[PDB]
Design a protein around this motif. Sequence first.
Motif, PDB file in Angstrom:
ATOM      1  N   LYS A  33     -25.449  26.257  79.897  1.00  0.00           N
ATOM      2  CA  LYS A  33     -25.503  25.790  81.295  1.00  0.00           C
ATOM      3  C   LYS A  33     -24.347  24.825  81.642  1.00  0.00           C
ATOM      4  CE  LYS A  33     -30.511  26.304  81.316  1.00  0.00           C
ATOM      5  NZ  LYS A  33     -31.862  25.672  81.252  1.00  0.00           N
ATOM      6  N   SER A  34     -23.139  25.171  81.188  1.00  0.00           N
ATOM      7  CA  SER A  34     -21.902  24.450  81.540  1.00  0.00           C
ATOM      8  C   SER A  34     -20.659  25.386  81.535  1.00  0.00           C
ATOM      9  CB  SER A  34     -21.688  23.281  80.565  1.00  0.00           C
ATOM     10  OG  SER A  34     -22.816  22.422  80.477  1.00  0.00           O
ATOM     11  N   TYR A  42     -16.589  26.180  82.488  1.00  0.00           N
ATOM     12  CA  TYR A  42     -15.332  25.405  82.562  1.00  0.00           C
ATOM     13  C   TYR A  42     -14.178  26.241  83.100  1.00  0.00           C
ATOM     14  CZ  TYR A  42     -18.355  22.896  79.463  1.00  0.00           C
ATOM     15  OH  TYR A  42     -19.458  22.317  78.872  1.00  0.00           O
ATOM     16  N   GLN A  80      -9.591  21.081  80.930  1.00  0.00           N
ATOM     17  CA  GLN A  80     -10.798  21.833  81.398  1.00  0.00           C
ATOM     18  C   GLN A  80     -11.621  21.176  82.527  1.00  0.00           C
ATOM     19  OE1 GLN A  80     -13.136  23.273  78.052  1.00  0.00           O
ATOM     20  NE2 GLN A  80     -11.236  23.492  76.834  1.00  0.00           N
ATOM     21  N   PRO A 133     -14.809  21.155  84.308  1.00  0.00           N
ATOM     22  CA  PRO A 133     -16.186  21.661  84.273  1.00  0.00           C
ATOM     23  C   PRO A 133     -16.737  21.936  85.679  1.00  0.00           C
ATOM     24  CG  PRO A 133     -16.226  19.299  84.092  1.00  0.00           C
ATOM     25  CD  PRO A 133     -14.777  19.694  84.092  1.00  0.00           C
ATOM     26  N   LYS A 186     -20.246  23.218  88.151  1.00  0.00           N
ATOM     27  CA  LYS A 186     -21.658  23.505  88.409  1.00  0.00           C
ATOM     28  C   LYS A 186     -21.917  25.023  88.309  1.00  0.00           C
ATOM     29  CE  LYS A 186     -24.597  23.621  92.559  1.00  0.00           C
ATOM     30  NZ  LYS A 186     -24.537  23.497  94.046  1.00  0.00           N
ATOM     31  N   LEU A 244     -22.790  28.602  88.827  1.00  0.00           N
ATOM     32  CA  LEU A 244     -23.409  29.407  89.911  1.00  0.00           C
ATOM     33  C   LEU A 244     -22.524  30.601  90.384  1.00  0.00           C
ATOM     34  CD1 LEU A 244     -25.389  26.620  90.315  1.00  0.00           C
ATOM     35  CD2 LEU A 244     -25.326  27.381  92.663  1.00  0.00           C
TER      36      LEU A 244
END
Lengths: 409, 83, 22, 129
Positions: free
Chosen positions: D111-112, D114, D123, D125, D127, D129
């Motif tokens: 759930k991350s 980059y 990098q 990062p 959200k 989606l």
Amino acid sequence: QPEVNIGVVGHVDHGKTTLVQAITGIWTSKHSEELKRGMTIKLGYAETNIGVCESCKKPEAYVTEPSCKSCGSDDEPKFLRRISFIDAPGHEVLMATMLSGAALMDGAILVVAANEPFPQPQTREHFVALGIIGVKNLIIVQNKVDVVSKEEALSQYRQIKQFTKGTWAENVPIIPVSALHKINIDSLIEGIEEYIKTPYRDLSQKPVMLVIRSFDVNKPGTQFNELKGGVIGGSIIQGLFKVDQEIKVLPGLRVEKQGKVSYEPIFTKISSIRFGDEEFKEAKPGGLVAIGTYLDPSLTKADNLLGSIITLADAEVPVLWNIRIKYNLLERVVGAKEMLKVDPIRAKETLMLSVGSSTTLGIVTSVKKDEIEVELRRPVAVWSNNIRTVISRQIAGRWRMIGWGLVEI
Amino acid sequence: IAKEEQKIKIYVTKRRFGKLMTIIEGFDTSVIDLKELAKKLKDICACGGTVKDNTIELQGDHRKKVAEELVKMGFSRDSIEIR
Amino acid sequence: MRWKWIKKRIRRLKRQRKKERG
Amino acid sequence: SEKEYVEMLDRLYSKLPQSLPNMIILNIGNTTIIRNFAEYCDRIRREDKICMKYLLKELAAPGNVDDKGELVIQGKFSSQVINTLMERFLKAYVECSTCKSLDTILKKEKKSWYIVCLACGAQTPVKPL
RNA sequence: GCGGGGUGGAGCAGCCUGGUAGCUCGUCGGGCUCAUAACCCGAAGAUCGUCGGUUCAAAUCCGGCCCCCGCUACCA
Ligand SMILES: Nc1nc2c(ncn2[C@@H]2O[C@H](COP(=O)(O)OP(=O)(O)NP(=O)(O)O)[C@@H](O)[C@H]2O)c(=O)[nH]1
Ligand SMILES: [Mg+2]
């Protein structure tokens, strides 16, 4: 079981949870789907083992498993202790659950972001909540040092070394990390091994514990015949519980009689004990525990007995409606972007009284120099005379820490 | 408890006999309660009104009022537009 | 009228008596 | 005590790692069809479904990609508000946060996600989606 | 864990009670109009999530396995 409870505090998105990922390997889930798009919302939870590479060099000696062949050579790292975290949220208004959480903590780690202007509204708000409550075992951390100039994470270490000065935080050590790529975390492990030391808790004391979750293990559709019991989620603070002990919760459920209100204690037996993913037969302080019960899960679904406290069945604990707080105030409102001066308390006003893990509201009847009496809505089970409490107000739509003190009975 | 924020368009509209009305649209119908919001807003404006599909309507020009009342309640000053 | 007033008086009383009780 | 810190700082830091083709948009009753939604997403290194999921969620409309690389959004939207919500996408998911290159890969883990630039090496990062 | 849907490009009927795959749009061609896809006409295009069974025969009835959205909820 875990020996000790450590907070991970700080501002929103500064990577408190991501730093609990890089130490435990465990994510808080980021859930409610709304947390999967927001961020952590209910209190996260994660555990791990801290050994030590005896036969090699520190801080890289400080392992996460029984494996020393990673650093120097093989000699299987002597296990020092098992631990557990409590990840508070970072968003300004989820102040009322982080306070609540702070009734369980033995120590903390302050996660500051290396790529934002240092004293951020919540970073501070949290810190002084720490200084207030008595969590004197802090380690500051500068998190996002993987996205900044090598000058920039130094000039901020100035700003931290100057804030951390007139406040109580002597050598509170600032270990720069990168929670993302898990670089320089073993030096954070050396910090937490030294500074956040395992306190002594007297087991002979009256069994008392706090509750911050509680869940219906029952999946959508477990048949009646194997309906496992309801599950209360919280941390022991004084004593040690055992499998097959009779127990009561407080203040407990309220009845309804035509507009009346009346809470009362619930009794049950400890069906099972578990820490992490491994079931235990006893439980002791430090760590958050969970207690399988034989009471109707409808009673403990969403998180219904949140704020409650568990004790021995046939014990002596007052369930107060009205209470005598001795108290003191912050001179500012370290919380709001704005620092507007805390006014003096007015009578017939609404305030958010955090006592133990329960987050109640209540109305002020009397106002002295430092002694106020507060009528409440949902009662409070006052297990001792050493009940630290925290006092908030609604300043502008969002709830704000403004004074603290002790509960008097 | 929850959160949720949305883009808010406030503007003068039109009703039958009587004055113009004020439309407040663009709230998240899952999370936000337009019926609790609107009871609160009819109190601030002191106007009759309704929840009209996904909108609140308030009888008369209340456009500075409402924005001033919405921002208080913990909505973003930057998501709101009075037209 | 006296409907009005009785409930206004009652609400005043209650709300205030709530504020006294609290 | 800086000498314990300034030593820990120097030890972390030693462990460290083309215009855009004019999106052609039309209208055909009640559809808005980006003719090169495949070629455009092919020339920012992105997956058609991640620009589609985002540009569709932002629009609040439905759609699927054709069988020759064309977006058929089921809602007739003006040829401007697709650029303004296709630039924003670029800003949040392709433009790295260090040197503004657009020359980026998109990582995914649990759930991350980059943004990984091919020029500087940092990098951003994002959200997920 | 229950559902709810999946079908020419697209929106979707049809599936109950199985028997040449329909509609609207788009496209494409022609026509009509002074010029309009405005109307009139035609074509193209879905082996109806997937895999399999039953049946003479299935998009339909049946069951494993996916893809989005309501229900649940961080499940000690
Ligand atoms: N580049 C970089 N990114 C990071 C680092 N740590 C976290 N991130 C990223 O930042 C985002 C936010 O992380 P998160 O842990 O939720 O921050 P938080 O303060 O714990 N959120 P919450 O207020 O809910 O507790 C994540 O998407 C993550 O990928 C870091 O050290 N470096
Ligand atoms: Mg977090």
